[PDB]
RNA sequence: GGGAGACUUGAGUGCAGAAGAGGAGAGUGGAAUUCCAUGUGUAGCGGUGAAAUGCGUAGAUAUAUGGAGGAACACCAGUGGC
């Protein structure tokens, strides 16, 4: 119901950006994404859509009561920063920013190149 | 060229060292993917030039904690090595 510390997971891919705000224990509290704000197609991948997604999820998160979050950024999407700053704007206190992009230490064979 | 000798440079042995993803066998490590279980959580997720098929309110994706299994070995790493 009422939290004081949390973490905001910015899952930003090439196609879409999902913003998920959890408590420090990883339990979800609020989440938004470019797709759930009406953005479709390439628009979902833009920094502005990432910005709007962060705002909509931030405001819901602060309705619960939540002051300061740390940010984990993942994926190659262009909207990582626009989300990080949007968190600060809408009211949250961004204390730390980390990169948690998974990296195989090799790992599995990736899919084929998109031509031929 | 054949025969009987002699020789130490070619070739090999000894002795002393040097480096190495050379090979074979048996173990073993972490990262990641997938699946599985359990919380949290809510309507999307995924994808393209643009879309749709697909997946999701029988609760997804995300996120947290674990479990299983397979394959490949980030950095080191280099017209570097064998
Ligand atoms: Mg194919």
From Swiss-Prot:
NCBIfam families: PRK05309.1, uS11_bact. Keywords: Ribonucleoprotein, Ribosomal protein, RNA-binding, rRNA-binding. Transmembrane segments: none annotated. InterPro entries: Ribosomal_uS11 (IPR001971), Ribosomal_uS11_bac-type (IPR019981), Ribosomal_uS11_CS (IPR018102), Ribosomal_uS11_sf (IPR036967). Belongs to the universal ribosomal protein uS11 family. The gene is rpsK. This is Small ribosomal subunit protein uS11. SUPFAM superfamilies: Translational machinery components (SSF53137). Part of the 30S ribosomal subunit. Interacts with proteins S7 and S18. Binds to IF-3. GO terms for biological process: translation. One of its GO terms (molecular function) is rRNA binding. It comes from the Bacteria. GO terms for cellular component: ribonucleoprotein complex; ribosome. Located on the platform of the 30S subunit, it bridges several disparate RNA helices of the 16S rRNA. Forms part of the Shine-Dalgarno cleft in the 70S ribosome.
């Amino acid at each position: 119901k009422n939290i004081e510390s949390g973490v905001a997971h910015i899952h930003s891919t090439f196609n879409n950006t999902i913003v998920m705000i959890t408590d420090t224990h990883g339990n979800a509290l609020a989440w938004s994404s470019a797709g759930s704000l009406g953005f479709k197609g390439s628009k979902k991948s833009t920094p502005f859509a990432a910005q709007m997604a962060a705002e909509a999820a931030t405001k819901v998160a602060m309705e619960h009561g939540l002051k300061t979050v740390d940010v984990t950024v993942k994926g190659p999407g262009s909207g990582r920063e626009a989300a990080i700053r949007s968190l600060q704007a809408t009211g949250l206190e961004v204390t730390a920013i980390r990169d948690v992009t998974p990296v195989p230490h090799x790992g599995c064979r990736p899919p084929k190149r998109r031509r031929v």
